[PDB]
Amino acid sequence: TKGLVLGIYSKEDEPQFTSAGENFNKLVSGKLREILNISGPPLKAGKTRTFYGLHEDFPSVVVVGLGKKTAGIDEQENWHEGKENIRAAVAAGCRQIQDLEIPSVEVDPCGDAQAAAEGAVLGLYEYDDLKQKRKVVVSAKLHGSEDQEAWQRGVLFASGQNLARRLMETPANEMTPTKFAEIVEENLKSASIKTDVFIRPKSWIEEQEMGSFLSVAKGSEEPPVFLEIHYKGSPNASEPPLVFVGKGITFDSGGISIKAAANMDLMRADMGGAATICSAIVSAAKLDLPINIVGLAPLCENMPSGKANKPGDVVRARNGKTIQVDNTDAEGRLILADALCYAHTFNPKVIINAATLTGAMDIALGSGATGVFTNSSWLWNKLFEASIETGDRVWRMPLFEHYTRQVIDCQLADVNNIGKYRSAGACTAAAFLKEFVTHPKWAHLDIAGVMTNKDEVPYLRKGMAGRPTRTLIEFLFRFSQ
Amino acid sequence: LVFVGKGITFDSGGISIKAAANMDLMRADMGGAATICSAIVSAAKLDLPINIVGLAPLCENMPSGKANKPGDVVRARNGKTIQVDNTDAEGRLILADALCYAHTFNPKVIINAATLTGAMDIALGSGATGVFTNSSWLWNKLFEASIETGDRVWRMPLFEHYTRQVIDCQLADVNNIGKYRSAGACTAAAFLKEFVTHPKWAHLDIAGVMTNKDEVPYLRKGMAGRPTRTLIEFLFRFSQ
Amino acid sequence: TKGLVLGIYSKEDEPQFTSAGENFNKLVSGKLREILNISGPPLKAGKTRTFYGLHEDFPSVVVVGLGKKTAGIDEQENWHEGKENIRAAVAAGCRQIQDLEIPSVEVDPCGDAQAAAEGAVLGLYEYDDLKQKRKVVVSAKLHGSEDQEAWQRGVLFASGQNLARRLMETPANEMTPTKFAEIVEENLKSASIKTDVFIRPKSWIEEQEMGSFLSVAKGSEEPPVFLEIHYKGSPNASEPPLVFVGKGITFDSGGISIKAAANMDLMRADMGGAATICSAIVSAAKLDLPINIVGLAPLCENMPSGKANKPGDVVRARNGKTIQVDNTDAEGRLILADALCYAHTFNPKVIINAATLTGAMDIALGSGATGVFTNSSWLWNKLFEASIETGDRVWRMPLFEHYTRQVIDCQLADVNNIGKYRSAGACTAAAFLKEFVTHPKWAHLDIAGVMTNKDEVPYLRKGMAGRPTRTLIEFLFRFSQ
Numbered sequence A, C: 001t002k003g004l005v006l007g008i009y010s011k012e013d014e015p016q017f018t019s020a021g022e023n024f025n026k027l028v029s030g031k032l033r034e035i036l037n038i039s040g041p042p043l044k045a046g047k048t049r050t051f052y053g054l055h056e057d058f059p060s061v062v063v064v065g066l067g068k069k070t071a072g073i074d075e076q077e078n079w080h081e082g083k084e085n086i087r088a089a090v091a092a093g094c095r096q097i098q099d100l101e102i103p104s105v106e107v108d109p110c111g112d113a114q115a116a117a118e119g120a121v122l123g124l125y126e127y128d129d130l131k132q133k134r135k136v137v138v139s140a141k142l143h144g145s146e147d148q149e150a151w152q153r154g155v156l157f158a159s160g161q162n163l164a165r166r167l168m169e170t171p172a173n174e175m176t177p178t179k180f181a182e183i184v185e186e187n188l189k190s191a192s193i194k195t196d197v198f199i200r201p202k203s204w205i206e207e208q209e210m211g212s213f214l215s216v217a218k219g220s221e222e223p224p225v226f227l228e229i230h231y232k233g234s235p236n237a238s239e240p241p242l243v244f245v246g247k248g249i250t251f252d253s254g255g256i257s258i259k260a261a262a263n264m265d266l267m268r269a270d271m272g273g274a275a276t277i278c279s280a281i282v283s284a285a286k287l288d289l290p291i292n293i294v295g296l297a298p299l300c301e302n303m304p305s306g307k308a309n310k311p312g313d314v315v316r317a318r319n320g321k322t323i324q325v326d327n328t329d330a331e332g333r334l335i336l337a338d339a340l341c342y343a344h345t346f347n348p349k350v351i352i353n354a355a356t357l358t359g360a361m362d363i364a365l366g367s368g369a370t371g372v373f374t375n376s377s378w379l380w381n382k383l384f385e386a387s388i389e390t391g392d393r394v395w396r397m398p399l400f401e402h403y404t405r406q407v408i409d410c411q412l413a414d415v416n417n418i419g420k421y422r423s424a425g426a427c428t429a430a431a432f433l434k435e436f437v438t439h440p441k442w443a444h445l446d447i448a449g450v451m452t453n454k455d456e457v458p459y460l461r462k463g464m465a466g467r468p469t470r471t472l473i474e475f476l477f478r479f480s481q
Numbered sequence B: 001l002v003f004v005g006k007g008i009t010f011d012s013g014g015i016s017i018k019a020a021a022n023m024d025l026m027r028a029d030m031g032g033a034a035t036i037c038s039a040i041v042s043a044a045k046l047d048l049p050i051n052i053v054g055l056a057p058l059c060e061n062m063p064s065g066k067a068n069k070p071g072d073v074v075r076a077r078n079g080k081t082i083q084v085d086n087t088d089a090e091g092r093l094i095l096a097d098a099l100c101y102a103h104t105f106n107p108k109v110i111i112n113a114a115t116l117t118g119a120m121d122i123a124l125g126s127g128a129t130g131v132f133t134n135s136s137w138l139w140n141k142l143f144e145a146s147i148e149t150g151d152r153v154w155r156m157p158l159f160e161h162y163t164r165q166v167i168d169c170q171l172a173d174v175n176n177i178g179k180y181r182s183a184g185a186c187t188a189a190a191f192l193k194e195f196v197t198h199p200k201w202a203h204l205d206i207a208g209v210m211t212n213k214d215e216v217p218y219l220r221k222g223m224a225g226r227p228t229r230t231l232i233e234f235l236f237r238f239s240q
């Protein structure tokens, strides 16, 4: 059987159906509006109502509130409101169809086939892999034939996100460093033949003088990996690549500066930064975006042991700078210090890194937006514009020499791994990373607060969220224009 | 133009009592009143040709046998009920009535200042004071004002996302603390938005720029008086 | 308009409707089963499905899964399963009718009019009093005329509970000691003319030598009250009363042993014990139960101040025993010590007290059951049997001299207010109270873990739960037989 998701707008006499809803109402000789009318209150945005037996092929029709037809970019909220309405409403419709165990659903494009595809595929996603109680996986399809490219591009963007949620969600004993490197490799090679994957072993990592990455890694028995992803999509094979770097800690216990036990299981998602940048690169190659992109993810685990990093140790990063490890839980900093050095080798046009770096970001913006520190207002503008379309917001945070001073604490080393005071922890972790970039166009995104979803963005179940993957794909999309 | 300032003259936390460590700095919880009143004294010394009202609710927040209890529902001047879930989120409560009264004056602009939240300190920690504003015009004038004074301002988001977190019904129209711990500056500001209907309001969270240690060199270590010159400079330029 | 809630049983060909569902299906010429059939999967227990436009008078019909028709008493779970199924299913049906803002609902009795009334009235309850956003309050009515007494007795039992949730939920600055005493007075006097209410002031309380109650009270500015409720429902006016005692702390801050800030707002519900026993007595008088019942609730607030109780103080209870107050947050103990002395004055047949005494009860049984300590297996049996009918369980906990030894710590006093070790805190708080009863039939119910509902019992919204009020009404009901 099929289910049909149909949208309507908020209230004229009648609140308007979409063209597809209106066309369905004519095909059932006015029944759909009749029952909608005797059924109760007008549906508002994100609200659904389900009707049965109106048509032989659609035993379940779910009508969904899209909000005001007029909705556009909201200057205060910094997103396109209308598309947010369409993702929210279609996900709520689709999820009613899966609770009735119906295996396929025709979705009305609602005026924007791309965001309706994104609502349906985000909305229906689940991670029930290691459970014996799995949900019915239903397959969403565009209702109609008129903008199947826009539907399929949304399908594409919502899967990139879903790959990243899956990557993040999987338990750390399953998603080890080589296992993640293998999933990404497999996915990237299915995306395009214009790809190259290098799963670099410890041997290579130590030939590259990556001392601060290697010192995080040694306290675990799990072999680290340096994952080098290439998408050569430019016609000019010598066109300078954009490089994405991502913190891939596959589990963070804290090391010897050990984490509290409460809710420590969420640190399986400390490789969110690698999940995010690698999924956006798989999507860019599926999209055959005409640009060269390198992806760099140092993968390792941070564990207490008799060979772990000790508070006070001084390690040497690939640029020769010494780093005093004052707290072993400020490990991503260390990892990214070498990876951001290596990023420069590629002669990049742009360097963007992503990391679940700091609980300070969560106290600061708590999932309303991911924080970005950038030395370039041009980069800031392109990322900000990219998030107005996706609804997955970005908010700029300061790169002031003020926070740098706080981490240039000599004592034994050139730089300290944690700021001198507790204040502005996101700001001093970003200033730490500035010490390893000499590039005029670098952006640091702190993903820690947008790592999980509970109820905040309606089209995502409660779980690891995969954010800001579509802001990154959209940024690449527009850049390759 | 009306300036409003949190004047808690000492904050112990009430029954949600503060930890003992470094509690002496809450003598500076009236920093918001100190800041807006000093800028108005300076504007009148400067004979700036504008009308300015300053509004500072002054009181102390102490545990006693008549103190506010966690869970109480109080009624603000606009009739909204407010569930006091934590008595240490008191400035919120104080400013809720004062920002109602601010509207009586038919103001061109409403700016309030408060040492509201240690979350601001975790967020920007004295590199800048945080400002939440429903107007980019206000943001631009304040930002420009701080380029001259060196005493920086950094915009922070007023998203309905943080509002949802504080519109927790349970007993009241609004809760006094956000549902989750995340984004505490952002949900305290969204709480205050519930009491303004004015198209040009700015909320400055002064908590992280309250003290100086070594960060801005021309100030000894002590209570810093920030962002007073950004405010005087903003008034200066406005009266041009 | 009306909504109709109709139940069906789990699966024969067809899963069976109730008589009312079956009768409605005949009135719509087979439409209801037809649409039920094309609509999706068979409803299981507590699941609902809503159908629109089957009949002019019922634009919304909500069909609800009752589980197996055969369900009876479950030996492992210690409740009547079937009635639990009916409360759960009818509440879920009724709440669909309120989300559509329909103001009245006909409810199918489902084979047990009493539990269907209880599901509907519990299910629909809300506490939105001080909000400007209130829900539509819908009015549930029995579908039919055949067992309107059973429907109305369930209405009665579910309101007693709802009075107690409301009492518990209200903020402590509104529900002060005289305000609560006034609500209870007003309600009891509407229940019967066979009632007497005494709101005893401080003056009386100090003439009665109630030193340990008075020492909790003095640290707050709010005047304490001793509430004495009488329901003379026996034909023999000299028939010995059953007495119910309840801890009425209207807000507990901890005093000088001050509570942590986190979630302290829930201590507005520390008068749950008074709420519970007073609501059961209002219900017993509405039910014109032929017995004499006295209700005793010491009401006060526990606050830090310059006149509050100090850790180490020795106070004197009404029986002359000294009590060392080692921790001021073990105040209910102190309050109940005088009230349980006074209870003996009444020459009672039975003494039952209820108190949100101990977070140790919550660690022990955590809302699966309220804990009862009783020196009588006869009392235990009657309470246990009473909870098999209501589904609101009771679990016996030990009154061993082992826990008594732990609190007979002399040092300055006859008894200490907290046990010597942290272990068995519910057990040593109950052993403390045993020191003030000389009656052969006393039961202590520790209500702390069943104080709130989140998701655990389906027919209650998330909030203060009013438990175990119907176990108490049911116990009185059977006793007066």
Ligand SMILES: [Zn+2]
Residues within 6 Å of the ligand: A252, A254, A302, A328, A329, A330, A331, A332
């Ligand atoms: Zn860490």
Ligand SMILES: [Zn+2]
Residues within 6 Å of the ligand: A249, A252, A270, A329, A331, A332, A356, A357
């Ligand atoms: Zn980490």
Ligand SMILES: [Zn+2]
Residues within 6 Å of the ligand: B011, B013, B061, B087, B088, B089, B090, B091
């Ligand atoms: Zn405070």
Ligand SMILES: [Zn+2]
Residues within 6 Å of the ligand: B008, B011, B029, B088, B090, B091, B115, B116
């Ligand atoms: Zn304060």
Ligand SMILES: [Zn+2]
Residues within 6 Å of the ligand: C252, C254, C302, C328, C329, C330, C331, C332
């Ligand atoms: Zn207590």
Ligand SMILES: [Zn+2]
Residues within 6 Å of the ligand: C249, C252, C270, C329, C331, C332, C356, C357
């Ligand atoms: Zn208590």
